[PDB]
Design a protein around this ligand. Structure first.
Ligand SMILES: Nc1ncnc2c1ncn2[C@@H]1O[C@H](COP(=O)(O)OP(=O)(O)OP(=O)(O)O)[C@@H](O)[C@H]1O
Lengths: 285, 280
């Protein structure tokens, strides 16, 4: 296993910590070892290792943004960004737990949760128009067109005929999407990546984790994730509070939201997370 | 009234549904700090601190983008009492006792080295240098203050000793290499314990932050944990040269005077007494 394989390095990074007591999250390029107060990114390949210098820069940039909440802060020295490759990257662990959809049935919880989503997304949006932000973050062109290709190549073989027909309709709409490169976009802003304080009172946003797919892009991508997780009414509340309820935006969200389970399945496929692949392919096989 | 009751409107906005009377308040010189579970609310103690709070928020944002190998209080929200909401750095101070174990001591020293290296590296960044204060001849200004305020409280002998110590200060080169925390005592350095060996969580209380001489931070470490542990840090970090040693000793020798001076201004009689122990 990954803990066993990297036991020597982990003993140095986490002195006195028993390897078996730790946990692992699967990424496309990195395996993420989760300790009590910090996480250790271990590159799966040498190409993944060559990515880590850039990742350290990106996480430092995110750590400087005004989002109203925490992000995983790089615990390397600044010079690690100038390396050709790193054998690891350590980040601070964001405290808190996901919010279950249940909590939103209370309309005061819903308001306060929505407002904090708006602070986060407004900060990401404004940060998108900043050249030092734009310089450190990727900004792929025709990502939608290309995502559709990846789905047809990588996921259709795992689907039923009916599934492929369902997915085809969803993917086809994507070619209508404008290529928006305005905001910092998390790219995977499902409920498990948004952490709230385990404290008395109403939910308070602790921070956001798993920035693997972060880019300069379309804010509708993150709003789509929220809609997929929490449904139309909560989304509409976020859009209203944030000033984003125009029909152009609403339409892009709709289009992207219909692909969001496929985005999850594509991720699970590439990082070998079996259960999340099964979840993602629910109703496509 | 009470500070929690007094600030109840703001607290209800910043911490919705959180019972104010369940909170705690602490303070330093400039700020009343309401402590919540994962964050603190900094409120100005004076009209001066109120006017400077925007500036402080700017500095904290810069510090939040530095690679120090640990956490700092991240600005979450600022408004106008002006207020600043910062992330709460988890963990507790390390007691000197723990350093008696040499494996704990090596690991703790190494983590101080990372922190101090990060501060030093950041000091050569002009965007950092521009955002942070950098006073000229701070040690001469201090010396003038000590003579004006403390000498009258001191014996003749005491004044001889202090005058020597202050002379030594003037001899120092006026270094502006590093980000200097400026108040890096044990209580401002927080640790995760009981999960293997101590891990440095983060560092708090950055009100005295500046571009200056890192000997100042190293002096503070020696004050809190003694010369053996400081020696371990200096050796691990490659700072064990004579030049650094002299600067550290010179700064170290002014800690009692620094305490007496601050105690003399805020009328804290017991810290003024402690500070002046040698000098009267
Ligand atoms: N980010 C934080 N995380 C945890 N505790 C904090 C934080 N900020 C402040 N505190 C707590 O509040 C106390 C007072 O804060 P601090 O020393 O920063 O006050 P201050 O008046 O702003 O400082 P100074 O006297 O240096 O101007 C600290 O000793 C600590 O217990």
């Amino acid at each position: 296993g990954i803990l066993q394989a990297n036991r020597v390095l982990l003993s140095r990074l986490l002195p006195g910590v028993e390897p078996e007591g730790l946990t692992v999250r699967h990424g496309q390029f990195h395996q993420v070892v989760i300790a009590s107060d910090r996480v250790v990114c271990l590159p799966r390949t040498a190409a993944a290792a060559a990515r880590l210098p850039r990742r350290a820069a990106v996480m430092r940039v995110l750590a400087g943004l005004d989002l109203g909440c925490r992000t995983p802060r790089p615990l390397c020295e600044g010079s690690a960004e100038g390396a050709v490759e790193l054998p690891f990257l350590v980040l601070s662990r964001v405290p808190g737990a996901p919010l279950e959809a249940d909590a939103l049935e209370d309309s005061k919880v819903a308001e306060v949760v929505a407002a904090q989503y708006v602070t986060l997304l407004s900060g990401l949006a404004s940060a998108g128009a900043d050249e030092k932000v734009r310089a450190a973050l990727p900004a792929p062109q025709g990502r939608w067109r290309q995502f559709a290709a990846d789905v047809r190549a990588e996921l259709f073989p795992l689907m039923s005929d009916g599934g492929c027909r369902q997915a085809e309709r969803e993917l086809a709409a994507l070619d209508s999407l404008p290529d928006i490169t305005e905001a910092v976009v998390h790219g995977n802003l499902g409920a498990e990546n948004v952490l709230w304080v385990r404290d008395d009172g109403l939910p308070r946003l602790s921070g956001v984790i798993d920035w693997d797919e972060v880019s300069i892009g379309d804010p509708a991508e993150d709003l789509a994730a929220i809609g997929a997780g929490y449904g139309k009414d909560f989304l509409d509340q976020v859009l209203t509070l944030g000033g984003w309820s125009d029909r152009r935006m609403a339409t892009r969200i709709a289009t992207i939201r219909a692909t969001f389970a496929l985005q999850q399945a594509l991720s699970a496929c590439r990082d070998g997370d079996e259960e999340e692949l099964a979840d993602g392919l629910t109703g496509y096989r």
